[PDB]
Every structure is written in structure tokens, then in C-alpha cells.
From a paper:
The structures of the C-682 and C-672 were solved at 2.1 and 2.3 Å resolution, respectively, in the same crystal form by molecular replacement using the structure of the WT as the search model. We hereinafter choose the highest-resolution C-682 structure as the primary structure for illustration with difference between structures discussed where necessary. In the structures of the WT and C-682, residues beyond 672 are disordered. The results indicated that residues 681–694 are not essential, as residue removal in this region did not apparently affect product level (compare lanes 7–9 to lane 6). The RdRP core of CSFV NS5B is structurally consistent with the BVDV structures, with an RMSD value of 1.5 Å (92% coverage) between the BVDV NS5B N438 duplication mutant structure and the CSFV C-682 structure. Different from the observations in the WT BVDV, full-length JEV, HCV and the recently reported CSFV RdRP structures that have a canonical fold optimal for NTP entry and binding, the CSFV NS5B ring finger bent toward the pinky finger, partially occupying the template RNA binding channel. Although this conformation is likely not compatible with de novo initiation, normal activity of the WT and C-682 observed in the polymerase assays suggests that the canonical conformation also exist in solution and may be in equilibrium with the observed bent conformation observed in the crystal structures. The aromatic ring of Y471 side chain is wrapped around by NTD resides 23–27 through hydrophobic interactions and its phenyl hydroxyl group forms a hydrogen bond with the carbonyl oxygen of C25 backbone, while the carboxyl group of the E472 side chain forms two hydrogen bonds with backbone amide nitrogen atoms of residues M56 and G57 and its two-carbon aliphatic side chain region interacts with P27 and V57 through hydrophobic interactions.
Compared to the RdRPs of other Flaviviridae representatives such as the NS5 of the Japanese encephalitis virus (JEV) and dengue virus (DENV) in the Flavivirus genus and the NS5B of the hepatitis C virus (HCV) of the Hepacivirus genus, the pestivirus NS5B contains a unique ∼90-residue N-terminal domain (NTD) that does not have notable sequence homology to any other viral or host proteins. The global conformation of our CSFV NS5B structures is consistent with the recently reported CSFV structure with an RMSD value of 0.9 Å (95% coverage) between the reported structure and our representative C-682 structure. These structures together reveal that the NTD adopts a globular α/β fold with an α-β-α-β-β-α pattern. The NTD interacts with the palm of the RdRP core intra-molecularly with a mixture of hydrophobic and hydrogen bonding interactions. Collectively, these biochemical data indicated that the RNA synthesis fidelity of CSFV NS5B is fine-tuned by its NTD through the intra-molecular interactions with the RdRP palm.
Numbering used by the authors: 13 to 86, 89 to 125, 131 to 531, 538 to 671
The structure:
Amino acid sequence: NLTPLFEELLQQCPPGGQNKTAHMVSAYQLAQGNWMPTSCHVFMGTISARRTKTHPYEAYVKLRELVEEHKMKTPGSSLGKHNDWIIGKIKYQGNLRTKHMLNPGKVAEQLRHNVYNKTIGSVMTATGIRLEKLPVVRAQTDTTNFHQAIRDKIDKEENLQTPGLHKKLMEVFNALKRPELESSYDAVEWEELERGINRKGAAGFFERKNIGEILDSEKNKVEEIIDNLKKGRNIKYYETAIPKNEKRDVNDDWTAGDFVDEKKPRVIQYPEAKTRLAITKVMYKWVKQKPVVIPGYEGKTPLFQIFDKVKKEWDQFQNPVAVSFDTKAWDTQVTTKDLELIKDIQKYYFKKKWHKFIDTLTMHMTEVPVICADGEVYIRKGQRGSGQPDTSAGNSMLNVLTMVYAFCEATGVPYKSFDRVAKIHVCGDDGFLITERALGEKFASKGVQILYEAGKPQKITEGDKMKVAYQFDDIEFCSHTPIQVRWSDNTSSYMPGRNTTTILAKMATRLDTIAYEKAVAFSFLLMYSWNPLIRRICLLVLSTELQVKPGKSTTYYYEGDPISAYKEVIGHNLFDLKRTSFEKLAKLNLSMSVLGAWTRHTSKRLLQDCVNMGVKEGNWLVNADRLVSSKTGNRYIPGEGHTLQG
């Protein structure tokens, strides 16, 4: 009966190793009684117990007392010599009130709003969409809640992990390495680096120049950093902490969608622009995954392609299920040992001449001086800073290894046989695996405890089970879920679905012109053309002032005709989309009704606005909508057009 109470307590036990010298009993065996726990060090959900005529609740109280004794003993740490320089910049005593990491004081101070996209937002208002009923997106936070987020999320000790965990994770890696690439990676030239780089990439706290200014004028400074690291010499490594959606919350690289910003931690932590340049120039091939050596890495997969790709795997199983990865605050769960495992993997692929570079950078990353925007300093123990160049590749590989390990240990499948029974997909900490139902359910019921012991605790859920999808379109990935559409050529495919309320909110607002808005409308049309409401808002916006070209600040833009650009990447004309999955559409429209963001008139008013425009003489983008054209009697004839990134 008390099995759920024990299962909960086992998730508070310190991870331990296998104990052959004693009896290792589970939460079920404990709940049976006649089992006296001798220590709280948990291994695969089991602890050492003595056989001694014990009542179940007695065993529970002994285990709990053991956990509290252990917790009431697990200490301040010496600062590394290579971090001493930051103490020299301290001017005032600190007020972060951190409990588990040093707050040595505050350095001297150094020298964004959510506004409507007026055209997009007024098209919505014109149809009776109630903007003020849409959820809040891109919220900022004040200094007081920012420091609280630091105390809540970052101010912690490193996770304890199963003794010998990283040896096993390296064994998993050896089952998926690419030996033809061993010791082959070298730095890239400035020209290749500058091709894929956001020149607006943010300056660190002590920095004035952004990525582009440094590239134009201080390459020697970057090269000095590279040289120091290459020879194993310390650099003045630090990260700057800002609240999400602050002005310096800028992505160095192109992103596949706004989901990347949305999954960011509340606390953005990033190295200096000069230092990100130094890291990226040398480690380019790893941090950019050129080539892709992380199995299932979808970081480069456009969101309008991902679910068609995944459905082909799904169709190959007899009774497939998908098990979601749902780690709590992943970046705060990355340990020093985790980082050293990734370093060893990077040294596998890089030429030996960069091994000291990788050693020294990783050392700097194990104990990081972080300077808040307001000047407060904390010394972070391990973890991931979300603005590190290695965030996507390092987290993705760490996630793949940890999940393969956890799946194999839950199911009995050997590491080298994972690829025979399951397919994995990751984007940083986000992801899932597809496997046959029996294995998936085994993994979902045992994985919670195993993943906790591996230092990647899962979000707390019902009966401590990982989320299982029993039908393809219940998969969740990159904040989206598959939705099927029917094309006029008697085929079906999948698009990235998401709640209509959320899509509207993201489309309607930005953080601090029509050229930008038209790029947004095109970007959203590539993703959400399955959604008749989004589709028609997009077509109206794209109908605005045909003479102004789309801006290039967002995920995608079009050269020439946006309707032809759509066809180029989607594979059909917009006009050939004849049906969207009825059941899934209703699911993703529910919150429009719950929140009152629309009324019984909204869809017809938007249709009628499109028809009014499309019946008029001329070549109107709105007639690319199959139903609109059916009511207007006119079609859109596309010119030439191409989809571009950036």
C-alpha cells in the first residue's frame, strides 16, 4: 500500500552504486514489510535492507531518518586561482543572498518592451479577435524577480549522480561514435565563421562591442584568447546573467522558430562576444554540428519538416509509442562530470593540437564567475549557461547519452542494441524516443527514478511516470505537435501544430514596420497554414503594400512571390491544402473558446474580409486560400519566389 510513499522518498535518496554485500530491496519490497533499510544510498530504485521483522511504516521512518541524516551533512569551497581576478573588480558587498554558491560582492555599474505589431494586430482586431484575451508572451522581469530566479534555479549544489555513471555514458557514446571522423576536427577560417553569425550578438558585461564590431576591428583580441587557451593558459572567463527578453538576450545563430526563445531559462548566462567568437572559430564543427554526429539531433531540421520525417520512423514499428524527455530546468542539472564527459567526446573528434584548448575551456566552465546586469557576482558550480556556444550540441549529446542509458537500464536492452529497438530525437534537452509499446511503457515507469539518479530529474507527474504518446499526433517536440492535412492530389502530410491562442499571441507582439511584419506573416504561413484563421490573417498581412519587400530579421523571408516561396519548401501550393485534421484542429482551438479570444462570428468575419478583397479585380494573395477562391471565383497566379533563412 505504501509503495507510492516509498517511491517518492527514493527520489530524495542520494544516488549510490550497486551493493553485492547486502540485500537491495525496492519500494515494493519495502512496502511489504519485514525489510529493515540499512542505508539510503539508492541504486536503480533499490536500497540496502536487513531482514528483521519490521513493520512497513517502521521501514519508512528509518529510511526517512537516513535521508535526513545524510541531508544534514552534505560546505564552502576554495575559489580557483584562475577566477581570482573577479574578486579584484568587487566594489560593494553582495546582496544576492545565495546559499549554495559564492556571492563575493558587486562590481561597478556599467553603461525592451512588449509592443504590438500594428498591422498584424489590427488585422486580428478587424475580425473580432480580442487581443487582450490572448496569453502573455515574451514577458520581462524586474531586478527583484531576476535575483529571485537566480536563488530559485541557479543557487544549488551540483547534482549527485550514480557512481560510475559517466563511465557508462562513455560506453553508450562508444556504441554511437563515428570512427571515420576521429581526431579530424580543426578550426575554421574567419570567412566561414562570419557567414553564419549574428553581428548583433550581445556584448558581455565588461564589453562594449557586439559580435560584428569585434569582427570588424578586434580579431587580434579574439586570436589572443584562442592562443592562450591553445597553450593551456587561463583566460578571464566570465558569463553575464540577464533576465530572459532583456536587450542583450540575442541569439548568435539563426533559430528554427520562436520555440527556441520560449524554451530559454529565466536567467540567460552568456560568455563575452570575444570569447564566444574564440570558442566558435575553433570548435565550429562540433558546436554547429557540421557534420551531425549526435544521433537524432534535429537542431538543423526546419520545423515544417520535422514531423513528416518522424512519421516515417513511427510507421516502421508494429505497436509504436513515443516517450517524452521532460527534464526540469535542464541547464541547472548539468554537472561538472557531465561537462567533462562532453569534453572527452570533443577530444575524440578534434585534432590533438586542440586538446589543451578544450581542457582549459572546460576547466573554466566548471566554476564560472557570473556578473548580473546590475553588477552582482556569483560563482556558479558547473551547470550550463544558455548562451554558451556549446549549449545546443553539448546538451543534445548529453541528453542522447543519458536517455539511451536510462532506456537501456530500464528495459535490459544493451547499449549497442538501442538502435535496433528505438529511434531517438533531440533538440538540446527537448526530445523523445519511439519504440514498441512494451519497451516504451517499461522505460516510462522505471525511467523517472533512473533519470533522477543520473542527475536529470524529470518534471513531477502523476504516479511518477514519463509521458507516453499512444498515437502519432500526441507527440510533443519543440513546443509543437503533429497535425495532419489533406492535399488535393489525394495525399496527406503533417505540419507543426500548436494552440491557436499561442500562435496569435506570438504573431501579434514583439520586443521593441510593415517589412518586418510581412516577414513574420510569411514565417508563420510556412508553419501554420493548416490553421485557417492563422492562414487568412497571414494572407491579409502579405496583401499589404506589395511594393515593400519583406524584412530579413526573422526566421524566414521570401524573394519574389511568397506563395511560390511557400510551394518551394512545403511541396504543394497553398491552394492545394483542402482539409485539416478535424479532431486535432478542435483540440488546438479549444483555448480560443476557453479564453474568449474569438466569438461565434470571428471565422466568418475573417473569411468575409478575404472574399471581399478576393472578388475584386486583380491578382490577390487571399485567393491562394482554397475556400476563399471558391467563394470569390478568382485565383492567384504566382510569380517566381524562393524561401530564404536569416
